[PDB]
Symmetry: C3
Subunit: 301 residues, 3 copies
């Protein structure tokens, strides 16, 4: 079976200096089936991703049963699969100054590429959830060695609370050229009625020149070394009637390179029927950074 | 909600010297919704446009209410939105020698580009219609200055007749490099039963080197100047049973560069069920020009 | 009318030296209609082919009636349209060492390209079938001369047996640069209940440097000459319950260049509901060649 859904948005976005019109529309194909014994299977991708979905680079394919779910393609890594992101600000998703996304080390297109899908396994039973993910270590479908990513995460929900932890790592094919990386995460999520609170703390080490590129800094001409880092953040959103209001703040601190605090604040108003008016403000504390903002409408179909 | 429709065509096309097979198929995604108070919203794009629809370059998104309709993306400019084009000739739409399209100055991909949608506002009440359109003046979603287009048009229907006028303009970011342009249009449309008649007259001024490029002439190495131009045309089509027969003639006259008269004549025969046999002939009076022609079938799905 | 269907696959594939994850998903658009007198028409293409389907390069458009069926776009040539391919091995279709496809000389993207569809005509009456195909001889929709392909084939079914023959040819635009080519085929297909047997023999001549490129050999710097070739193969597959087992062997023998025997063996297990577990092995006898293999699941939607 093949089902269709879609979304679209239109409005004005401020890039720090000028306003521009910003709009888009997308269609999602959701495909599903069930075998004779009740294993469920499916696949999905968006219309603008159709070339990539044909090589494994975009979209996902899955098989699930009593054993849990196996998904291959452009999949999330294990930690992101269980804890997600902080409150999304602005109708265009204003990630220009850092954004709402939590800084996971693996999955979500870190190594996914043409002819190179990644794997995500999930399982839940009651109150508990576990996820595990990995890439295959070879470029495309070739025999050339690639960096290889892997992660494992577990969560437990008790009442209003889910708490969890994840561990992620990237193994370098050549540690003279790129240091191995790893990150450990603790995440907590709480709903107190109309209010959602999400918080995380992450700690680990990154390749030096990969870390410098986060801050848009040229690499140093030396053999690869690792730098220690930490990241933590929080978001709060609450709904009163048709109005949701929310925001987040995150800081990323990489030893010997730099630190940044980035944040955003936005609101939406539900018009019903799949339409909402959405606007927001986002920034970070780096020297140059002017605040980005937007105001428009989002539609679901 | 997401609906599907499509079209396809196949036949033989003569390019002035040789015949070639010419065929295509397309799918249109039409998405729609209604808010709780009855504002209607939607989006559409074709499958071959899906990459562009995701940045605002192709397809359109709209919101309408009692106030009229706001559309953003790859939109028509205000004059084209109210008066359209002359009778379309040939199953492949034989625009090779000039074509049936009326020469509007703005909208319809004049400035629309990646991350750069344009805006069209329309409103009707009874017998009267107004449209207004503009681009935002900045390249992409950047702060780089772009040419900016704008147009306004109004029409009035009285019986068999709609008459209207439009005014369009493009403001140059640097008039040493490209002159400002403007065009005023008068259009009339009349249906006399099975017969449709459409006529327009346009007058204004164009950038010199933009005008020379219409006639495929190299630019002159001097500071930009403006040239005066006029354009006018007429088409007639009539239906008798399953057969429609029609044609058009247009002339474009640009002062100090050149003039051209271009025309076409074609027919279609409806087979019912969404299929028709369509063929046509088109040419212009320039020196080289051999007549283009085609014959094939068009399908709607 | 527009209908949707799709497919997806995921598993592990061995390239001769290493295992890699390999997955994809696709959506097919099938469009159909009927005229008032009952001529049927349609078009189809897959979502990843939507750009190509808009110029004639990918997908097909057709019209059929009592006269047979005319199809234009990315069509099969006449022989492939009647006799098909040998048993397909592996969930990824392991064609890496030669594959299951029968080596037809024309159609199936030999000359199909942007703005350049090819034509396939088919007709059946009772026990007999005929097909005829051709390209138009001009590059794109231009007047530049291209190689031109053509083929004719006929088949007759009597009981469990279909036997047939086809003749295919490519006319070179310049025989100093590329020799003319031709191939004659005899094919037989037999179903003996759960068992399918397909066999063919082909004989003809190929351009020298086109033949050398099959074996990945550099061209010779001389005026084009033709080399004689023969190809023949067989496949057998049988189904017992949910299990199909099958394989094929083909040899290609080009005089003065080289010969190769390539083969594959695979199985599938139907899980019902549109899902199957599929795996296979394939190889050829050339010097370097290590065996390719895969194991995964295929889904239809
Ligand atoms: C020259 C400025 C052009 C600005 C064009 C904006 C196009 C997008 O429309 C959305 C703007 O956000 C505000 C809210 O619109 C929602 C409808 O009105 C509410 C009725 O209950
Ligand atoms: C553990 C891996 C973390 C990788 C993703 C981190 C994403 C963090 O967002 C950083 C936010 O800052 C934005 C970019 O910095 C460039 C700013 O311009 C420099 C001078 O103002
Ligand atoms: C297991 C979860 C533990 C999570 C603990 C950390 C959550 C709090 O960190 C939030 C960020 O630090 C706040 C201060 O930054 C202030 C300045 O930015 C301007 C905001 O307008
Ligand atoms: C806290 C949530 C709300 C954040 C709202 C941000 C403010 C947005 O409103 C201002 C819109 O006015 C800007 C100008 O429009 C520019 C149009 O571009 C066309 C130029 O000719
Ligand atoms: C070697 C020349 C090949 C030409 C191929 C033409 C393919 C397209 O078919 C359409 C041609 O236009 C003529 C009309 O066809 C309509 C069906 O016949 C009418 C029955 O009432
Ligand atoms: C007001 C803006 C008008 C811009 C669009 C005008 C489109 C007009 O069609 C012109 C028709 O002539 C075709 C092109 O000329 C090249 C012919 O080859 C030269 C020698 O034969
Ligand atoms: C407010 C609407 C006013 C419209 C007036 C103009 C309509 C007529 O112009 C049409 C073109 O001029 C006709 C002469 O060209 C003849 C030669 O071309 C060969 C045709 O086979
Ligand atoms: C006034 C409306 C009618 C316009 C009809 C134009 C004339 C079309 O009919 C002629 C078709 O015959 C041309 C040849 O077919 C070429 C096929 O290409 C394959 C070459 O091997
Ligand atoms: C680290 C190795 C990862 C391998 C991932 C394989 C992902 C694809 O799954 C398909 C493998 O083929 C075997 C059969 O799976 C079918 C389900 O089990 C049968 C229940 O009746
Ligand atoms: C009549 C036209 C035939 C054109 C298609 C033939 C396809 C045949 O498959 C050939 C199989 O061999 C694979 C390619 O050879 C390269 C191997 O590497 C060389 C040294 O091992
Ligand atoms: C009109 C149809 C006539 C078809 C006759 C030919 C069919 C048989 O040819 C098959 C291939 O030759 C078999 C020998 O190759 C053996 C070695 O390869 C290793 C297999 O594991
Ligand atoms: C005759 C039909 C059966 C052909 C089956 C081929 C054999 C397939 O099974 C072996 C799978 O085990 C291989 C290893 O998995 C590799 C995963 O890649 C991740 C590396 O970290
Ligand atoms: Ca985001
Ligand atoms: Ca992410
Ligand atoms: Ca790989
Ligand atoms: Ca046209
Ligand atoms: Ca136009
Ligand atoms: Ca812009
Ligand atoms: Ca194959
Ligand atoms: Ca083939
Ligand atoms: Ca051609």
């Amino acid at each position: 079976e093949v089902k269709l859904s879609g979304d679209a948005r239109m409005g004005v976005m401020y890039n720090g200096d000028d306003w521009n019109f910003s709009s888009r529309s997308r269609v999602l194909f959701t495909m599903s089936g069930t075998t004779d014994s009740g294993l469920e299977f499916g696949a999905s991708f968006k219309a603008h991703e159709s070339v990539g979905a044909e090589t494994g680079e975009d979209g996902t394919v899955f098989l699930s049963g009593a054993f849990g779910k196996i998904e291959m393609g452009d999949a999330l890594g294990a930690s992101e699969a269980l804890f997600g992101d902080l409150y999304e600000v602005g109708y265009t998703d204003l990630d220009d100054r850092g954004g709402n996304d939590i800084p996971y080390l693996t999955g979500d297109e870190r190594l996914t590429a043409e002819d190179n899908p990644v794997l995500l396994y999930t399982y839940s039973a009651g109150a508990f959830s576990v996820a595990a993910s990995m890439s295959d270590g070879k470029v495309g479908e070739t025999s050339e060695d690639d960096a290889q990513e892997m992660a494992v995460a577990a969560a437990y929900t008790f009442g209003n609370y889910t708490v969890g932890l994840g561990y992620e790592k990237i193994d370098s094919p050549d540690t003279a050229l790129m240091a191995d990386m790893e990150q450990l995460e603790l995440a907590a999520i709480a709903k107190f009625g109309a209010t959602n609170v999400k918080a995380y703390y992450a700690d680990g080490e990154l390749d030096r020149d990969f870390a410098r590129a986060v801050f848009d800094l040229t690499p140093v001409a030396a053999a690869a070394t690792a730098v220690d880092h930490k990241a933590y953040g929080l978001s709060v959103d609450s709904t009163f009637g048709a109005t949701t209001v929310g925001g987040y703040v995150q800081v990323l601190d990489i030893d010997t390179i730099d630190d940044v605090t980035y944040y955003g604040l936005g609101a939406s108003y539900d018009l019903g029927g799949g339409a909402s008016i959405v606007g927001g403000i986002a920034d970070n504390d780096l020297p140059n950074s002017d605040m980005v903002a937007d105001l428009g409408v989002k539609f679901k179909f």
